[PDB]
Design a binder for this molecule. Structure first.
Ligand SMILES: Cc1cc2nc3c(=O)[nH]c(=O)nc-3n(C[C@H](O)[C@H](O)[C@H](O)COP(=O)(O)OP(=O)(O)OC[C@H]3O[C@@H](n4cnc5c(N)ncnc54)[C@H](O)[C@@H]3O)c2cc1C
Ligand SMILES: Cc1cc2nc3c(=O)[nH]c(=O)nc-3n(C[C@H](O)[C@H](O)[C@H](O)COP(=O)(O)OP(=O)(O)OC[C@H]3O[C@@H](n4cnc5c(N)ncnc54)[C@H](O)[C@@H]3O)c2cc1C
Ligand SMILES: Cc1cc2nc3c(=O)[nH]c(=O)nc-3n(C[C@H](O)[C@H](O)[C@H](O)COP(=O)(O)OP(=O)(O)OC[C@H]3O[C@@H](n4cnc5c(N)ncnc54)[C@H](O)[C@@H]3O)c2cc1C
Ligand SMILES: CC(C)=CCC/C(C)=C\CC/C(C)=C/CC/C(C)=C/CC/C(C)=C/CC/C(C)=C/CC/C(C)=C\CC1=C(C)C(=O)c2ccccc2C1=O
Ligand code: SF4
Ligand code: SF4
Lengths: 92, 438, 336, 282
């Protein structure tokens, strides 16, 4: 709600059929992870840990790369979106 | 049909286009592959771009970029602000010879790299946007012989491949370089806002006029005790306000890195400057800044492959010289390949000259200097936690006139500085940082 | 003099019954003729065997009716309508031509206005007469409903204006007034048939989500795809399409062709049901051009309530099946 | 072989062109201009018509000088030629003025390849979503207008006649169009391809054929603000909707259901539903 007000300002070409943020193992995010640093350090609120699993709202991804690096267990299959997709920064 | 090229430069940032500018000016069939819609579409930078690494690339750079919208508000004043609870210690330096011999311009990188792509296109390079490189097509010798893309019939053949793709070294790890990924102490999460401030409040709050710019560097307790160097730059009709903090500090604090930008907007001084021009945010960005440097860079060369810019982790983030290092690294890689093209050898015997040029120039000497800089800043948590808020209450007490007889303000400052930290902590910390500055 | 300021309204009929927009424009042109000096509201109607509606137009407010007669005008062929709706404009010389913004209406008006070489605005919402040169100020939404641009045609005649169905208001059918019905038995001759209609597929064979009068949509409060059958019970009841959010499409509950919002489909129904949608700005940018927004979600501090017209704080599996249950017993009491 | 001409329009990216309430204007500065998304389906159909029947597809745009980048993005689909009608004689044009320029633009294309067998437009542009250029272009040539195309069945190149499925409001309908026709494509026809590199690289080093108002031979004031009958006199953003009120609550388990139908009938728009007349008329 709060940061998706500011993500509305950015320009995107969303690739909804190709999620570039896949989580390799959902069970590592349930019992192996304690603090979930992918949620607390994502500048775009992409990751939200529900009890249904991890909700990865990849459409707002700013392609920074923090989630892949801050994740201690490596279970974020992180790619850039394809060419002409993802954030399209105007006056970046 | 085979798409044949001489060099393929992955990435169209500062190091990608400066590498492609020298190859295209020297008559090489060089292709640039950028995964954005236009060059600059994925690039985040607050803006201070220094004109000397570009006057080595383009000796007529300030004439070509004056008519365009690439550059923005020539930087004549560089401030450093120590934000307190309610005060600020501005330590600026305005120079007026920077009005006619410029040192730096503020930029917006979608406006700069789109113009810089047009000069690289006029130089003779084929810039291919909307195209992400996935891996490298290899010959049976096992070396990088080109580039495969996400496009259907996408296989670009080249005698050399320049991995100028910035931070997130995904494509560097495919080339055998970067034997591990980035750990969250080699990078800093940098969250930036571009705020629309209408061209005359920019003149008023920065103390400038008429395409002359000022840069603020913000320190204080908005960064929650972590060493975050925020910034506040003057664009033409805008203000690019952002903040960057290390990932190790951000992970163990768990505080959502746009909140630091909200602590930076809602400071009493920044909310006084931009009163209600704070919430007309035009854009919200996030990126990473390589901060490991010398201890964390890859092998920047290989068989038919070079690595420039943030992909080689060439960033002096304490001086904010990353584009300074990137545009030079493109020039050193392109002059290495121009040696490699007259000899016809592209292996690690000729392409090791790029690593020799990288340490004979300023790029690796700035990395050796601030090598143990952020591990020094991580083992205090004092220079942005007590030290700005104490220098603000001391200088406020120094200027407050309340009938206190100036010896009892010279000792109330001493009772201020030797209460939040002992004198064995103050005199230690001035030279404990001296080892970080070398 | 006075009968040269003669404003036209086209009647869109589907077999035997007219479209409702035909009588909302007849009633709107009455408010245009009340501010136009020395004017009368005609009605142009094409086909044979439609005296049951040509008299209905005069009860709705048509001053006169031009009832053009041919057997090949009951079906909609824009090639044949344009040949007749520029002979009935060259003959009578109207001042304001009004067609509804149905899909036949927007397609027909584009063919007509470039035969007359006049000016045409599509999907207008703000027709009004300025008092200076008696001109029609055709206010229409552009940029997907983000700019209500006001467009005036100064000198070319007629000032054609395709008007969005539903923005005008009907006059009640009054049998007191009468008017002349002009029958022009239209001849085509050798006509060289280009458009040949083979079939007519029903509209519910695909996903419409822009030409549906009711869009009932949900996401993430519709727990699982079991709740979207409860939303489809309300969809086919009201004769409309079921929508979704990104949080429902990404969870795999409905197909991505049912997605409503910024990177989905921008709906324009007369009644939107935000059934369990939080109402983020990327979703409500596709629903803000609607007429009624009903919001049913369990969080009272939700941003959908800042755009909703009817707001319910409550569960979705205990209100939406409890609303289509009550709507069945009220739709059958006036059916038989 | 057929001759296809795809009239595309460079449109700002209206997913990002948003309403700023505090300045009460569209913040469309910095937002780059793209193909009209109804025309990417027209270009993808034209590229399908080029690999199935070998039709020489041209693409034409009457726009600003910055609209040559949209014409280069159309060559990335695999098309043969792009044609630019670039002149500020054509500036401020309306639909009658655009169609008069586009009729004489395609008429000069007809002097190069032959009579155009098919003209593909989009259903609507998004800036000024009128959708009358496609209908208007079928009248200048006197071609069969198949508008709102959702499917393409038999595109018989021997009988010079093809079957489309036009969407109307009562339902879809199959139509035997007679070529030469002017189609008008919706979003639901296809999904546009991810372009390959040999076409995208060719799209980068391509220069569209620029034709001014002297090149076409048309009237000098039948194309701009003077050939425009209509005049846009004022553009203004809409209002902030209308604050609603929680009709029911979290207490009423169903009694909120009839309170919805209580408050539905206070609105005018429920007459328009076509299925809530037995609760409004009675
Ligand atoms: C907030 C912030 C502020 C900064 N401020 C300053 C400053 O004031 N001064 C300064 O000197 N430096 C500054 N920097 C640093 C500067 O942005 C970088 O150090 C430098 O500009 C990066 O150059 P680059 O060539 O690596 O380009 P990058 O922008 O890092 O990336 C190059 C390009 O590669 C492309 N790319 C990546 N992967 C692929 C792929 N697989 N296929 C194809 N293309 C790909 C991307 O689209 C990108 O455009 C700042 C950085 C940040 C984050
Ligand atoms: C570039 C971009 C484009 C986007 N495009 C779109 C788009 O086209 N369309 C789109 O929809 N989104 C789009 N989004 C996503 C958008 O920003 C929101 O994140 C998204 O719409 C959230 O979906 P939601 O409201 O259904 O889910 P949530 O935000 O989780 O909504 C859940 C709501 O349901 C309520 N609820 C919970 N349980 C119940 C129950 N039992 N009964 C009733 N209510 C209940 C909750 O209280 C809450 O209000 C886009 C995002 C980006 C970044
Ligand atoms: C706020 C505003 C309101 C306007 N209102 C009107 C109005 O009411 N009536 C009116 O006639 N004009 C109007 N215009 C101007 C009108 O858009 C131009 O005359 C333009 O030529 C028609 O574009 P369109 O929006 O009607 O697109 P459409 O006609 O809906 O576009 C349909 C298809 O035609 C083709 N096409 C459209 N434009 C071009 C072009 N320039 N070159 C080539 N092919 C093209 C494309 O294939 C496109 O997909 C308005 C402009 C603005 C800014
Ligand atoms: C009479 C005289 C002695 C008055 C003293 C005034 C004094 C404050 C400045 C001039 C004194 C000179 C002779 C000192 C020599 C060494 C100087 C250059 C040390 C630099 C540290 C500070 C004080 C610089 C001034 C503030 C302002 C101009 C900074 C610009 C902003 C950016 C570009 C710089 C970022 C930056 C910051 C923020 C550092 O904290 C830091 C710490 C250690 C090394 C480098 C840096 C650094 O580069
Ligand atoms: S960090 Fe790795 S483990 Fe912890 S939650 Fe995110 S993904 Fe699951
Ligand atoms: S990339 Fe940056 S934004 Fe996209 S998810 Fe990882 S962290 Fe959040």
């Amino acid at each position: 709600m709060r940061i998706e007000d500011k993500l509305y300002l950015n320009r995107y070409r969303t690739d909804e059929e190709n999620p570039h943020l896949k989580i390799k193992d959902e069970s590592i995010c349930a019992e192996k992870c304690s603090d979930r640093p992918c949620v607390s350090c994502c500048p775009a609120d992409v990751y939200e840990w529900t009890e249904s699993g991890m909700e990865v709202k990849f459409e707002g991804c700013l392609e920074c790369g923090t989630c892949r690096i801050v994740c201690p267990f490596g279970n974020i299959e992180w790619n850039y979106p394809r060419g002409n997709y993802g954030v399209l920064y105007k006056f970046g | 049909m085979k798409i044949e090229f001489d060099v393929v430069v992955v990435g169209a940032g500062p190091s990608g286009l400066s590498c492609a500018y020298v190859l295209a000016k020297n008559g090489l069939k060089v292709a640039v592959v950028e995964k954005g819609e236009y060059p600059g579409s994925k690039n985040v930078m607050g803006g201070v771009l220094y004109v000397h690494p570009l006057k080595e690339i383009m000796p007529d750079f300030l004439e070509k970029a004056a008519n365009s919208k690439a550059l923005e508000r020539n930087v004549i004043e560089q401030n450093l602000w120590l934000l307190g609870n309610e005060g600020v210690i501005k330590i600026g330096h305005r120079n007026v010879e920077w009005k006619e011999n410029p040192n730096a311009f503020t930029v917006l990188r979608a406006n700069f790299d789109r113009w810089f792509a047009q000069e690289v296109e006029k130089a003779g390079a084929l810039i291919i946007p909307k195209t992400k490189v996935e891996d490298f097509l290899r010959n049976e010798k096992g070396e990088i012989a080109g580039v495969v893309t996400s496009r259907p019939k996408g296989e670009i053949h080249s005698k050399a491949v320049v991995i100028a793709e910035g931070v997130n070294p995904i494509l560097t790890m495919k080339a055998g370089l970067r034997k591990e990924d980035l750990k969250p102490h080699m990078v800093a999460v940098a969250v930036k806002e571009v705020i629309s401030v209408p061209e005359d409040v920019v003149n008023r709050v920065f103390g400038v006029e008429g395409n002359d710019g000022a840069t603020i560097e913000l320190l204080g307790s908005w960064s929650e005790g972590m060493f975050g160097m925020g910034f506040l730059y003057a664009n033409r009709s805008s203000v690019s306000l952002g903040c960057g903090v290390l990932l190790e500090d951000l992970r163990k604090k768990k505080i959502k890195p746009y909140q630091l930008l909200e602590n930076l907007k809602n400071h009493p001084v920044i909310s006084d400057m931009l009163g209600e021009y704070r919430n007309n945010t035009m854009e919200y960005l996030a990126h990473l800044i390589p901060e490991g440097g010398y201890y964390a860079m890859p092998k920047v060369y290989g068989d038919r492959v070079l690595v420039c810019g943030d992909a080689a982790m060439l960033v002096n983030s304490i001086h904010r010289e990353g584009s300074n290092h990137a545009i030079t690294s493109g020039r050193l890689a392109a002059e290495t390949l121009l040696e490699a093209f007259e000899k016809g050898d592209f292996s690690e015997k000729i392409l090791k000259n790029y690593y020799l040029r990288l340490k004979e120039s300023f790029i690796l000497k700035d990395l050796e200097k601030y090598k143990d800089l952020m591990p020094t800043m991580e083992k205090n948590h004092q220079f942005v936690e007590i030290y700005p808020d104490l220098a603000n209450d001391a200088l406020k007490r120094f200027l407050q006139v309340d009938g206190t007889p100036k010896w009892d303000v010279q000792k109330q400052i001493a009772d201020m500085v030797l209460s939040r930290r002992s004198l064995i902590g103050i005199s230690l910390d001035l030279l404990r940082f001296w080892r970080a500055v070398r | 003099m006075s009968e040269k300021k003669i404003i036209f309204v086209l009647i869109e009929h589907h077999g035997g019954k007219a479209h409702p927009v035909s009588w909302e424009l007849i009633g709107k042109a009455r408010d245009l003729a009340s501010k136009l000096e020395n004017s009368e509201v005609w009605g142009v109607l094409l086909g044979e065997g439609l005296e049951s509606v040509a008299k209905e137009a005069i009860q709705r407010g048509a001053d006169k009716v031009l009832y053009v007669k041919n057997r090949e005008f009951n079906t909609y062929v824009n090639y044949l309508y344009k040949k007749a709706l520029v002979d009935m404009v060259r003959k009578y010389r109207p001042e304001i031509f009004l067609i509804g913004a149905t899909l036949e209406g927007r397609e027909l008006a584009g063919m007509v206005a470039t035969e007359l070489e006049t000016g045409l605005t599509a999907d207008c919402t703000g027709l009004d007469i300025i008092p200076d040169k008696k001109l029609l100020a055709m206010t229409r939404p552009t940029f997907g409903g983000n700019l209500m641009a006001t467009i005036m045609c100064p000198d070319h005649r007629p000032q054609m204006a395709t008007v969005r169905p539903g923005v005008m208001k009907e006059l009640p059918p009054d049998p007191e007034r009468t008017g002349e019905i002009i029958e022009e038995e239209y001849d085509l001759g050798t006509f060289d048939k280009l458009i040949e209609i083979l079939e007519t597929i029903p509209l519910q064979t695909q996903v419409n989500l822009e030409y549906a009068p009711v869009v009932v949509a949900g996401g993430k409060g519709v727990g699982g795809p079991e709740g979207f059958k409860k939303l489809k019970e309300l969809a086919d009841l009201l004769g409309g399409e079921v929508g979704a959010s990104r949080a429902a499409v990404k969870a795999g509950w409905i197909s991505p062709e049912h997605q409503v919002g910024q990177t989905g489909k921008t709906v324009r129904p007369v009644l939107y049901f935000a059934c369990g949608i939080s109402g983020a700005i990327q979703h409500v940018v596709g629903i803000k051009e609607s007429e009624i927004i009903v919001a049913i979600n369990i969080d009272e501090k939700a941003p959908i309530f800042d755009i909703a017209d009817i707001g319910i704080v409550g569960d979705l599996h205990k209100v939406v099946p409890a609303l289509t249950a009550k709507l069945r017993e009220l739709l059958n009491k006036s059916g038989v | 072989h057929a001759n296809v001409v795809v009239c595309i329009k460079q449109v700002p990216d209206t997913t990002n062109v948003r309403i700023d309430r505090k300045t009460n204007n569209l913040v469309r500065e910095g937002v780059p201009s793209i193909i009209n998304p109804d025309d990417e389906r027209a270009l993808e159909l034209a590229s399908q018509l080029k690999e199935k029947f070998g039709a020489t597809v041209y693409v034409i745009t009457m726009g600003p000088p910055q609209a040559k980048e949209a014409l280069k993005d159309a060559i990335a689909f695999g098309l043969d030629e792009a044609v630019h009608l670039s002149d500020r004689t054509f500036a401020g044009a309306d639909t009658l003025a655009t169609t008069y320029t586009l009729y004489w633009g395609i008429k000069k294309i007809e002097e190069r390849i032959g009579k155009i067998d098919l003209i593909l437009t989009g259903k609507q542009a998004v800036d000024g979503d009128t959708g009358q250029v496609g209908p208007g272009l079928a009248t200048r040539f006197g071609y069969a207008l198949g508008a709102y195309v959702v499917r393409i069945e038999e595109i018989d190149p021997e009988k010079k006649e093809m079957v489309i499925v036009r969407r109307l409001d009562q339902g879809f309908e199959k139509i035997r169009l007679k070529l030469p026709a002017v189609l008008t494509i919706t979003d639901e026809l296809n999904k546009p391809r991810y372009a390959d590199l040999p076409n995208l690289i060719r799209a980068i080093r391509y220069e569209p054929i620029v034709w001014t108002h002297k090149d076409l031979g048309l009237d000098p004031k039948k194309c701009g603000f003077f050939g425009s009958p209509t005049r846009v006199v004022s553009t203004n953003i809409p209002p902030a909707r209308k604050g609603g009120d929680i009709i029911s609550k979290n207490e009423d388990p169903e009694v909120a259901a009839e309170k919805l139908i209580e408050a539905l009938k206070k609105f005018e728009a429920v007459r328009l539903v076509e299925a809530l007349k037995p609760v409004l008329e009675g």
